[PDB]
Design a protein around this ligand. Structure first.
Ligand SMILES: [Mg+2]
Lengths: 87, 30, 102, 9, 49, 76, 110, 76, 98, 91, 88, 66, 71
DNA sequence: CCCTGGAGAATCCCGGTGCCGAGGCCGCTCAATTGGTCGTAGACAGCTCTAGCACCGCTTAAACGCACGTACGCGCTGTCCCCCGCGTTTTAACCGCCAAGGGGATTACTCCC
């Protein structure tokens, strides 16, 4: 089966593998498990922000996620605000 | 100084034991 | 070796080998192995001139690291292009205010 | 910028 | 307790001191327990009265 | 264009695991760090509408409706 | 003279120096200082006493403790300059927590 | 150890910092913030000591922590 | 110490300086700058080991003649007398080849 | 030409979380830019850390250590939770 | 263990031959060399990431992007000299 | 528009100005000026005076790493 | 030399909407100078990006990259 | 009161003695470019494309000055708190002291050649 389906997730690993092979430094290369873990983390964070923004839109009775809802969710979860200030 | 890279090279199971500073003790007491 | 062919003091074959090991991009033009070496020699040469005059200022033949700090902190451009590094054996340049001293 | 304060100092 | 370079030092302290330095007899006094039986019994009797 | 992208992802999902000596994580891995609190997937929390914002900053028609309409709803 | 001495003692005499000039001379002498100032051994004592909380058997090196000492010693000095400039910006030649908090909230603590 | 940087040490550090008069209620907060900074840097150092779970901390670890902490240092 | 040394460099204001066994260890920089015609090491049992810090500090002092006084010369260690002869030996000169 | 991005995948993730609500244009652009920034920062940190460890054995531990050291405790710990479960499900 | 000690000594004799050195200065200058090199290379790579790419011009334009023009003109001149010498 | 034209065409003439990177400049400078103005206001009210005098913003910008 | 042609009443209105009970001409001049300096210090990297973009027309990608570099 | 002498003395720079330090000398030793090919990808034409330039010109709403008019930073004042330097007192590392293990080996023993 597909490796992404094997992981039991939604995010695809191959894209991150391609975009991470760019970060290879000569004799130094990266593995597939690292890309799978990165995809898991990215899917988790995107699911969290999507849930927060969708709940914020439901508060506004909007069926479409708004960037203002995104920043309000970031403000509510101070960890997200600290992360976005750090990154 | 005898590093831990030999264990990593012999067995690929765990390659975290790569570099040590005082495990050899040659760097500090030889 | 590489220095004689390039006609440059700082070795570039080792530097170019390090750059190749870096693999910063798929397209790595290898026609200029000494460009970064050239700019670093120019920077270090002007820094060395500043440090040398600073060391000769206080009858110091050997460059004390304080002289290096004074050399790298006495120029607006040098502090502008980097000013967030704390060098060993510190000590800011002397300063005083119009209110503390008559 | 050709010279600015590169030689006077 | 492998080390013994000073293992005779406590013996020397014992011989010279005569346990008037290792542990002296104190001024004996009884226990000073303070919780008291009636610590949590004044409220009930006050309410009852 | 998502079909070809998904096929490429599936094809590339096997090349990266055999790029030399990897032996990833020694077939073992630490469990949930600290304590397990991720829930099923998310937290399941919402936010309010009224001065709750003024409570939030004390606890620490975007670009007009024409632009609200301008942002096209995404179709898969 | 406490006791037997070179003849008559008390040569110290009342020679108190008023502040300001003494303060100026000591800051002038301190500015040219470039080496380490605080005692290093209590520093390593405290840093080891605050390292086992993460884990024990971490071990250390002289280069490490030296680098942490250099990092902490070369960072708070700029804080001192900023606090002093904020202090003499107002009519307070002495230092109070107001201007140090001011410096914290202008240097981007977060 | 709370009293690592003792009162005379903080006083001479402040005098090196060019202050006319130093009040007697200023060293506590400075000590608190420098202890917070020290805790942060030692936490980072112990994190990258376990990057390869090395059983020793060296200058490389602390320079890593400080160079990604934003307060870059030199002399090495 | 500074006040005493103030009137010590230029003139012959003294002949004997009363110095303890441990004072010379920290004040060696001022001590070695002055050539001493004679020194005496009373109670030579104070210094007995060649690796001792006092041994290194006092070995290289510039002088012409040396003399050590003790209540009793040490025994149980021939290295003590060997080191005493070494301290009476020193061959270090300006040319470094005598 | 052709462009590659995470439209369908992020939409699927939202549908799993909030099926009724979608994603708007500039909100998607913001999310894609942020996720690209996070990926690039994690990848660069992992590469430089592996170079620092002087060993070419880049595992999920590299990305894990990056996530610890660039992101505060809450999001990092929950991400490592779900990633551990996903990895042990795949393995 | 290829360091820049010989190169540093050469540039010392070129600039101020009469001037000596400490025992820790060479580490500082080597750190300057390699850290400037790697940061400039990283900026060049991040600039070339957007443009499709699968040399002298890239290094020169990366230098001119961020590093000050007062030094950038000299950098470009010396790079042109170096590439001409290499082609010579 | 004329400001960015005069500061862009002086360094190099023949600089076509598309609508893109024009309102973005306005938004960026608006955010920057809002942040700087808030910093100056808080610095002024720290000095227990609503008025602004030049060394206040001078020191504020110095602590901005200028 | 249009750089001196910036209308002072613009700064007057900006200060009035920003508050403050005492906004002298010195404040206007200094804020104008720092705004011009910041505009120059961002347009320099913008135009360098355009030069190292193989393009001669200003586009939003250049300013996006400039602000990302500047934060 | 300004000015003069009268002394502690910072600084200058020189001594004056002790040392460790850059680099050369011997040893060797790892890779840069030649030498060429595989492919490849980035600029040379070709087509085009797309909203920017500048234009048309009323029209409110910035420019923009001015008199009432008073708010408070700062000029002075008084009112008055605790920083700072001289004399004391209590920790603190360091040099040794003492003596029972430390440990690779080869050189008597005895088992191998
Ligand atoms: Mg005797």
């Amino acid at each position: 089966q597909s490796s992404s389906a094997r992981a039991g997730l939604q995010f695809p690993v191959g894209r991150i593998k391609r975009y991470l092979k760019r970060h290879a430094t000569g004799r130094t290369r990266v593995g597939s498990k690292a890309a799978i873990y990165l995809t898991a983390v990215l899917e988790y964070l995107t699911a969290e922000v999507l849930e927060l923004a969708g709940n914020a839109a439901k508060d506004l009775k909007v069926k479409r996620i708004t960037p203002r809802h995104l920043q309000l969710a970031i403000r509510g979860d101070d960890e997200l605000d600290s992360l976005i200030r750090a990154t | 100084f005898g590093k831990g890279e030999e264990s990593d090279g012999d067995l690929d199971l765990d390659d975290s034991e790569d570099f040590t500073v005082n495990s050899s003790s040659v760097e500090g007491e030889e | 070796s590489r220095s004689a062919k390039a006609g440059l003091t700082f070795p570039v074959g080792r530097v170019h080998r390090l750059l190749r090991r870096g693999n910063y991009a798929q397209r790595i033009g290898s026609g200029a192995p000494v460009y970064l070496t050239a700019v670093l020699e120019y920077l270090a040469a002007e820094i060395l001139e500043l440090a040398g005059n600073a060391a000769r200022d206080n009858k110091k033949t050997r460059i004390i690291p304080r002289h290096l700090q004074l050399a790298i902190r006495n120029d607006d451009e040098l502090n502008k292009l980097l000013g967030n590094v704390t060098i060993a054996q510190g000590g800011v340049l002397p300063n005083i205010h119009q209110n503390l001293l008559p | 910028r050709r010279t600015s304060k590169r030689s006077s100092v | 307790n492998f080390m013994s370079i000073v293992n005779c030092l406590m013996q020397l302290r014992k011989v010279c001191n005569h346990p008037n330095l290792f542990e002296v007899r104190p001024i004996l006094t009884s226990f000073v327990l303070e919780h008291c039986v009636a610590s949590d019994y004044k409220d009930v009797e006050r309410t009852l009265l | 264009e998502d079909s070809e992208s998904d096929m490429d992802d599936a094809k590339l999902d096997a090349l990266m695991g055999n790029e030399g000596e990897e032996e990833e994580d020694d077939l073992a891995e630490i469990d949930t760090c600290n304590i397990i609190t991720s829930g099923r997937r998310t937290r399941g929390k919402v936010i309010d509408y009224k001065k709750t914002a003024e409570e939030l900053d004390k606890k620490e028609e975007k670009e007009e409706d024409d632009e609200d309409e301008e942002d096209d709803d995404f179709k898969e | 003279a406490r006791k037997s001495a070179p003849s008559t003692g008390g040569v110290k005499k009342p020679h108190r120096y008023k502040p300001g000039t003494v303060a100026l001379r000591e800051i002038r002498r301190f500015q040219k200082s470039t080496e380490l100032l605080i005692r290093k051994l209590p520093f390593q004592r405290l840093v080891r006493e605050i390292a086992q909380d993460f884990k024990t058997d971490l071990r250390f090196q002289s280069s490490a403790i030296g680098a942490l000492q250099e990092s902490v010693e070369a960072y708070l000095v700029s804080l001192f300059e900023d606090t002093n400039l904020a202090a003499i910006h107002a009519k307070r030649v002495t230092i109070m927590p107001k201007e140090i908090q001011l410096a914290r909230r202008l240097r981007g603590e977060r | 150890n709370i009293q690592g940087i003792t009162k005379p040490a903080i006083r001479r550090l402040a005098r090196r910092g060019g202050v006319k008069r130093i009040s007697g209620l200023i060293y506590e907060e400075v000590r608190a913030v420098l202890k917070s900074f020290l805790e942060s840097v030692i936490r980072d150092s112990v994190t990258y000591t376990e990057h390869a779970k090395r059983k020793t901390v060296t200058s490389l670890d602390v320079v890593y922590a400080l160079k990604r902490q934003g307060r870059t240092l030199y002399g090495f | 110490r500074k006040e005493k040394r103030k009137g010590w460099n230029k003139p012959d204001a003294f002949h004997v300086c009363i110095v303890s066994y441990q004072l010379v260890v920290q004040d060696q920089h001022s001590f070695k700058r002055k050539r001493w015609q004679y020194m005496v090491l009373d109670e030579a049992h104070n210094i007995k080991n060649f690796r001792s810090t006092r041994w290194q500090a006092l070995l290289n002092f510039n002088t012409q003649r040396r003399l050590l006084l003790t209540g009793t010369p040490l025994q149980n260690n021939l290295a003590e007398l060997w080191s005493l002869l070494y301290f009476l030996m020193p061959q270090t000169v300006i040319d470094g080849k005598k | 030409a052709r462009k590659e991005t995470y439209s369908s995948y992020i939409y699927k993730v939202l549908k799993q979380t909030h099926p009724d609500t979608g994603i708007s244009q500039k909100s998607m652009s913001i999310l894609n830019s942020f996720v690209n920034d996070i990926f690039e920062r994690i990848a660069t940190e992992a590469s430089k850390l592996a170079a620092y460890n002087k060993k070419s054995t880049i595992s999920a531990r590299e990305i894990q250590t990056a996530v610890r050291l660039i992101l505060p405790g809450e999001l990092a710990k929950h991400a490592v939770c779900e990633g551990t479960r996903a990895v042990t499900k795949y393995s």
